[PDB]
Amino acid sequence: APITAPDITSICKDASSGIGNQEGAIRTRKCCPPSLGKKIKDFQFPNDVRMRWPAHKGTKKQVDDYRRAIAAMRALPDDDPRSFVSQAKIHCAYCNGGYTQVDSGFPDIDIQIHNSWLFFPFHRWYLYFYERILGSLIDEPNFALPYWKWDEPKGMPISNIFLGDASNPLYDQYRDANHIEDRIVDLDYDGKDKDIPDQQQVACNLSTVYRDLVRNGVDPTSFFGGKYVAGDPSVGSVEAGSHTAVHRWVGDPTQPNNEDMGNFYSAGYDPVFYIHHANVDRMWKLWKELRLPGHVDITDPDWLNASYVFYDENKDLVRVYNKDCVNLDKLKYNFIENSKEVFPWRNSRPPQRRKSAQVGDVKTVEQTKFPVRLNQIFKVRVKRPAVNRTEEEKDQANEVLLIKKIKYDSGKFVKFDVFVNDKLKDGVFTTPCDPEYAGGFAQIPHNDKVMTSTARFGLNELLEDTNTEGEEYATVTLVPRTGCEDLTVGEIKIELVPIPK
Ligand SMILES: [Cu+2]
Numbered sequence: 231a232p233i234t235a236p237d238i239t240s241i242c243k244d245a246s247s248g249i250g251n252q253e254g255a256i257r258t259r260k261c262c263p264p265s266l267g268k269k270i271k272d273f274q275f276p277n278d279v280r281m282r283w284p285a286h287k288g289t290k291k292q293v294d295d296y297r298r299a300i301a302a303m304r305a306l307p308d309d310d311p312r313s314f315v316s317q318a319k320i321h322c323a324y325c326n327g328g329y330t331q332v333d334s335g336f337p338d339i340d341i342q343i344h345n346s347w348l349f350f351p352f353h354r355w356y357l358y359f360y361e362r363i364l365g366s367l368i369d370e371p372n373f374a375l376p377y378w379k380w381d382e383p384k385g386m387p388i389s390n391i392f393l394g395d396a397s398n399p400l401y402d403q404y405r406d407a408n409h410i411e412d413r414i415v416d417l418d419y420d421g422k423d424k425d426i427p428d429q430q431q432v433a434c435n436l437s438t439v440y441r442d443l444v445r446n447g448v449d450p451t452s453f454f455g456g457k458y459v460a461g462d463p464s465v466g467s468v469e470a471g472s473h474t475a476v477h478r479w480v481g482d483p484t485q486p487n488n489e490d491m492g493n494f495y496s497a498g499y500d501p502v503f504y505i506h507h508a509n510v511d512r513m514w515k516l517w518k519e520l521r522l523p524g525h526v527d528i529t530d531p532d533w534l535n536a537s538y539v540f541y542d543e544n545k546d547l548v549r550v551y552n553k554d555c556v557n558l559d560k561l562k563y564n565f566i567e568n569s570k571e572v573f574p575w576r577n578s579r580p581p582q583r584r585k586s587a588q589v590g591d592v593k594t595v596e597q598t599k600f601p602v603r604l605n606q607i608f609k610v611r612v613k614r615p616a617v618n619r620t621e622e623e624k625d626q627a628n629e630v631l632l633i634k635k636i637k638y639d640s641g642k643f644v645k646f647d648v649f650v651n652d653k654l655k656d657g658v659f660t661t662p663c664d665p666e667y668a669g670g671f672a673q674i675p676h677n678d679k680v681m682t683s684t685a686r687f688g689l690n691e692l693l694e695d696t697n698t699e700g701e702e703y704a705t706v707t708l709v710p711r712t713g714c715e716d717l718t719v720g721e722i723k724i725e726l727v728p729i730p731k
């Protein structure tokens with residue numbers, strides 16, 4: 231029973247999900263696509279590779295092509311599926327409950343590609359057509375999108391090509407003014423700017439990438455997201471991590487729903503949105519090229535046969551499947567990489583905690599009455615499935631912390647941090663990217679006419695970094711950051727997950 235997008239031209243409705251303040255909304259909620267009376271045809275692969283370039287190291291030609299392309303797209307009539315507005319509505323229609331699972335036999339259930347394993351493949355198809363449309367608008371058959379390389383220090387700030395004023399096609403007034411001044415991106419943003427040096431921000435941005443691709447991105451479930459079929463799946467490490475941070479970091483916090491980037495329904499109206507996801511799409515490639523155990527593609531038929539519908543460069547309706555976007559070579563595009571051998575985030579594992587900087591009585595899961603609400607710092611000891619595991623055992627299965635049944639009002643942005651075994655003496659110098667930090671759970675608004683979620687955290691490296699591989703219990707600390715005044719956690723447990731081959 232795979233998720234199947236219906237006739238987006240026939241069955242569609244106004245966006246009513248993920249919008250806290252529907253009144254005084256800067257962008258439209260009528261995200262339905264144009265009706266050209268088109269028949270949905272099956273997808274077919276292209277022929278001869280599009281090289282996507284770093285937005286911060288683009289040449290005059292590369293930048294001019296992109297600017298001229300967006301300008302051409304902005305020039306098209308709104309009724310055109312290939313227009314700037316129509317393309318932005320695509321994200322709104324799929325992320326803010328524009329369609330339903332009517333094709334699966336459930337017209338009362340909305341389709342939501344986010345917070346599931348449909349996250350990566352959908353946005354890949356989204357960019358694929360969005361990329362080919364722009365290329366056709368400027369008569370560039372080998373046109374390629376840039377990508378925001380925020381995993382590299384010099385590429386972390388927003389590229390100046392997007393800055394300027396309305397004369398620039400890549401400009402968007404609806405961005406955070408405090409963040410467009412050549413300032414470094416915060417890949418662990420929680421709604422409030424941190425008072426740290428630029429050196430520290432870059433160092434911890436690299437750590438965030440390492441945390442999302444290695445520490446937490448241990449298996450297909452933890453990386454892509456939870457299983458989602460027709461009829462509260464886990465959110466991926468990338469999706470609920472660096473990805474969400476950038477959206478809230480760029481979005482203008484003065485606007486009602488943090489438009490444009492700060493919300494799904496309006497994100498498409500900012501040109502940087504597609505360039506951000508261009509690098510999120512690249513995380514998928516890097517995640518595999520690491521060639522670490524567990525870093526494999528999805529093989530579940532329920533995922534492979536899942537499909538969406540898009541307008542292509544020829545205004546034709548095309549149905550694409552997830553099974554046909556695992557190989558970039560077949561889609562005929564890739565990313566221009568640096569000559570340097572390794573990636574600066576490749577070894578950005580948090581430093582080992584000194585025992586001399588560490589020092590007790592905390593309730594366990596049995597002694598605690600669930601569900602608990604995260605209106606303050608919450609601590610609890612969780613029984614581990616094993617202790618003193620050998621290098622062979624830790625290389626065969628991941629010890630994963632599971633925070634399940636996360637209930638909360640998804641009318642606004644929510645985030646809380648997760649610390650494990652934080653027994654630091656009270657005179658120690660702390661940093662954002664400390665070893666105790668397991669990561670966080672962040673969610674862009676996606677409410678429906680209180681949402682429930684689940685998080686996953688790897689402990690293989692963390693327990694070693696905190697000198698607690700021999701301890702029977704692990705002290706888990708949940709720290710609310712924003713929108714947790716009503717958040718509720720239903721279950722907490724640690725389990726050994728075998729690494730798939
Ligand atoms: Cu999206």
Ligand SMILES: [Cu+2]
Pocket residue numbers: 473477507
């Ligand atoms: Cu996004």
